[PDB]
Amino acid sequence: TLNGGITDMLTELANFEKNVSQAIHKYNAYRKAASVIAKYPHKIKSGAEAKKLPGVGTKIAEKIDEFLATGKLRKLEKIRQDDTSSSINFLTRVSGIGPSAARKFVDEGIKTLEDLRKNEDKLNHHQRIGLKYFGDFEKRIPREEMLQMQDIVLNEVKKVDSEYIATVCGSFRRGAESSGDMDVLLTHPSFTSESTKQPKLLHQVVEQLQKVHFITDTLSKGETKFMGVCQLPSKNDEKEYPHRRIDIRLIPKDQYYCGVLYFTGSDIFNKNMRAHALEKGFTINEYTIRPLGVTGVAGEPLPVDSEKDIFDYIQWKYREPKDRSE
DNA sequence: CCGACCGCGCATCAGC
DNA sequence: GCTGATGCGC
DNA sequence: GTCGG
Numbered sequence: 001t002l003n004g005g006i007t008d009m010l011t012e013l014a015n016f017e018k019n020v021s022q023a024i025h026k027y028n029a030y031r032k033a034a035s036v037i038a039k040y041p042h043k044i045k046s047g048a049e050a051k052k053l054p055g056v057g058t059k060i061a062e063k064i065d066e067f068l069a070t071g072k073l074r075k076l077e078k079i080r081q082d083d084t085s086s087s088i089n090f091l092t093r094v095s096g097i098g099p100s101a102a103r104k105f106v107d108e109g110i111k112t113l114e115d116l117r118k119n120e121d122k123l124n125h126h127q128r129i130g131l132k133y134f135g136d137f138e139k140r141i142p143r144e145e146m147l148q149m150q151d152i153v154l155n156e157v158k159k160v161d162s163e164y165i166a167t168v169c170g171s172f173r174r175g176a177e178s179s180g181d182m183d184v185l186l187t188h189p190s191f192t193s194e195s196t197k198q199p200k201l202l203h204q205v206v207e208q209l210q211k212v213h214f215i216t217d218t219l220s221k222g223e224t225k226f227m228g229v230c231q232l233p234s235k236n237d238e239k240e241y242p243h244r245r246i247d248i249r250l251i252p253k254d255q256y257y258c259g260v261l262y263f264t265g266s267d268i269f270n271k272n273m274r275a276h277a278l279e280k281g282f283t284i285n286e287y288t289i290r291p292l293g294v295t296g297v298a299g300e301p302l303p304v305d306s307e308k309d310i311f312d313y314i315q316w317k318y319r320e321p322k323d324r325s326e
Numbered sequence: 327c328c329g330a331c332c333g334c335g336c337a338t339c340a341g342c
Numbered sequence: 343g344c345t346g347a348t349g350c351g352c
Numbered sequence: 353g354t355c356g357g
């Protein structure tokens with residue numbers, strides 16, 4: 001965190017553009033600059049020094065000069081004073097409340113945690129659960145708890161069908177000492193790109209995890225993606241563990257490497273890598289990497305036997321998960 | 327100067 | 343009910 | 353907000 005002051009500033013600007021302005025390209029511009037600066041191995045001395053980095057342009061260089069001189073950014077000091085922006089920014093921290101709903105809630109005079117808690121009937125299901133665990137979802141998960149959580153998920157999945165493979169991805173797979181939440185990649189041989197020889201594959205796993213009281217709430221659920229809430233068991237007289245967010249993604253078994261690349265991230269890493277894919281005439285998603293024809297139409301799925309094959313196609317040296325934390 | 331900015335699953339809703 | 347757009351999220 | 357063409 002050589003440049004923590006700067007990257008914090010940029011992230012707050014990023015958050016303003018997403019939540020308030022609803023300017024997603026600006027949000028992404030700010031996040032990209034923050035990311036490139038975060039890995040830059042020097043304490044930055046000027047906006048000019050920063051503008052050398054890709055993604056840092058004229059306007060952010062100016063802000064970095066202002067920040068270095070004064071320790072502050074006038075633009076942000078103002079945003080912080082503005083009640084409508086403060087309220088919107090607050091409300092979007094509830095899972096399920098995005099920029100649009102936040103602004104609509106403010107319009108109706110719902111703008112504090114108390115307001116939310118007295119108007120539960122104005123929330124959809126996701127939002128109500130996001131509100132219920134507002135505090136818990138703020139907390140990070142120690143790797144040691146992630147490890148206990150992995151063990152429960154892996155062993156319960158095995159009890160359902162020993163042919164399931166469950167892989168914990170996200171920042172955990174990147175080696176992080178703490179994680180925002182748990183991400184499980186699920187495969188089963190019955191579900192391939194060619195056929196689905198077995199229904200309820202995700203359901204069965206979700207039910208078993210609910211049965212043992214690991215999964216406690218559901219935010220959304222379909223055939224291939226679960227988004228919900230889980231909690232470690234606690235011992236006699238112990239305070240309960242906080243509730244945690246969990247995502248489970250069922251991916252065609254033959255498309256595992258594209259899936260685990262996607263689910264391992266980071267999100268900014270994924271965005272960067274997919275952009276680069278396009279520059280190189282490929283398109284990457286969680287299933288496949290395909291060539292872009294002479295017109296911009298995706299061709300057939302290229303063969304993939306490893307994460308490295310994907311990097312190879314786009315002429316990137318292989319990067320271990322622990323170095324994908326952009 | 328300006329087009330393009332990654333890709334997609336689930337929930338909600340409007341129109342038909 | 344279906345379809346397509348939008349919101350929110352990974 | 354930034355960048356390549």
Ligand SMILES: Nc1nc2c([nH]c(=O)n2[C@H]2C[C@H](O)[C@@H](COP(=O)(O)OP(=O)(O)OP(=O)(O)O)O2)c(=O)[nH]1
Pocket residue numbers: 169170171172176178179180181182183262263264265266267270271332333352
């Ligand atoms: N292609 C793409 N992938 C994304 C996006 N957002 C996003 O989270 N992903 C991927 C990469 C992430 O590592 C993975 C899991 O999301 P996550 O919110 O749990 O993030 P994480 O594990 O890296 O980090 P964290 O929980 O410690 O905060 O989903 C996106 O916008 N585009």
Ligand SMILES: [Ca+2]
Pocket residue numbers: 170171172179180181182183
């Ligand atoms: Ca995570």
Ligand SMILES: [Ca+2]
Pocket residue numbers: 170181182183246247352
């Ligand atoms: Ca997650």
Ligand SMILES: [Ca+2]
Pocket residue numbers: 180267
């Ligand atoms: Ca995230």
